[PDB]
Design an enzyme around this catalytic site. Structure first.
Site: not given
Ligand SMILES: CCN1CCN(Cc2cc(NC(=O)c3ccc(C)c(-c4ccc5nc(NC(=O)C6CC6)cn5n4)c3)cc(C(F)(F)F)c2)CC1
Length: 276
Positions: A13-14, A16, A18-19, A21, A134
């Site tokens: 998936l994505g 960058g 930093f990380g 997926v 964000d």
């Molecule tokens: C300044 C930087 N800071 C660091 C700390 N951070 C905190 C933060 C971190 C998040 N982390 C995510 O949201 C996250 C993390 C890791 C993964 C794997 C995923 C994720 C989950 C489900 C998913 N389904 C897909 N499907 C597809 O790609 C389909 C093919 C198209 C992709 N994924 N990827 C989401 C959410 C929130 C919040 F918003 F919830 F508060 C807050 C903020 C930034």
């Protein structure tokens, strides 16, 4: 909970700086089945990056709401010398991409359903004293045509710039608050009602207003001056006046006069009922 031995790669998936997926299948029974999950790992586990990733994990552990991404656990790889984060996989990816690819499935009632769910997720985050910073359709994920969830991909740490979602006091003073999340929500609502049409995104529109020639910090200087003196994204074609009014009220330079997320959810839900 998640042994590296049973976590099997399905799809990249994505990615960058930093990380990154990946789609993976967790198959503890070794029967070629198991649940599909989304897995984040760090590119470079420096002291600061690992601290940031550990904080991300602790934040996600504490959040449980229908419109917030769902945490599953962690998995240690490389003989337990690397750390990976396991989340529920959402098939349709970012709302920004879903809107471009699935216009055939989307009308104004649907956009307002997503708007309502975003507001409710933000109400929840406020109860956790969490400031998102964000909020943008690139960071909202789509489970199915009836359910979106707020996340924050954070894989990298003018068209690519986050500044076009930021409140004026975030630009000038680095002050991020619930009220600046409300400003950014107004930009999300704008994004929804443009359907992510090319040329109408917040960066494209703001750059047209300030001058496509401008580069570097000059963009920031002009954006601040524009916003401080009432320059705003225009009403999207076809967008009802009452919806543009919500955007306009979120984009108040007076921080304390912006609506609350509870106000916004009630207003959006009341409207949705009337068009339905
Ligand atoms: C300044 C930087 N800071 C660091 C700390 N951070 C905190 C933060 C971190 C998040 N982390 C995510 O949201 C996250 C993390 C890791 C993964 C794997 C995923 C994720 C989950 C489900 C998913 N389904 C897909 N499907 C597809 O790609 C389909 C093919 C198209 C992709 N994924 N990827 C989401 C959410 C929130 C919040 F918003 F919830 F508060 C807050 C903020 C930034």
């Amino acid at each position: 909970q998640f042994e590296e031995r049973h976590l099997k790669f399905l799809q990249q998936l994505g990615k960058g700086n930093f990380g990154s997926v990946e789609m993976c299948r967790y198959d503890p029974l070794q029967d070629n089945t198991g649940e599909v999950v989304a897995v984040k790992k760090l590119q470079h586990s420096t002291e600061e990056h690992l601290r940031d990733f550990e904080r991300e994990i602790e934040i996600l552990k504490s959040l449980q709401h229908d419109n917030i991404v769902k945490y599953k656990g962690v998995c240690y790889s490389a003989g337990r010398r690397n750390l990976k984060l396991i989340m529920e996989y959402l098939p349709y990816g970012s709302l920004r991409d879903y809107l471009q690819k699935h216009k055939e499935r989307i009308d104004h009632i649907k956009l307002l359903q997503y708007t309502s769910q975003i507001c409710k997720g933000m109400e929840y985050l406020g109860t956790k004293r969490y400031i998102h910073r964000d909020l943008a359709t690139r960071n909202i994920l789509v489970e199915n045509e009836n359910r979106v969830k707020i996340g924050d991909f954070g894989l990298t740490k003018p068209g690519e710039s986050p500044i076009f979602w930021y409140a004026p006091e975030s630009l000038t003073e680095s002050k991020f608050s619930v009220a600046s999340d409300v400003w950014s929500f107004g930009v999300v609502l704008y994004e929804l009602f443009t359907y992510i049409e090319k040329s109408k995104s917040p960066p494209a529109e703001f750059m047209r207003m300030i001058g496509n020639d401008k580069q570097g910090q000059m963009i920031v200087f002009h954006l601040i001056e524009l916003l401080k003196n009432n320059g705003r994204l225009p009403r999207p074609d076809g967008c009802p006046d009452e919806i543009y009014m919500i955007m306009t009220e979120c984009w108040n330079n007076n921080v304390n006069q912006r609506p609350s997320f509870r106000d916004l959810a009630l207003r959006v839900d009341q409207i949705r009922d009337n068009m339905a």
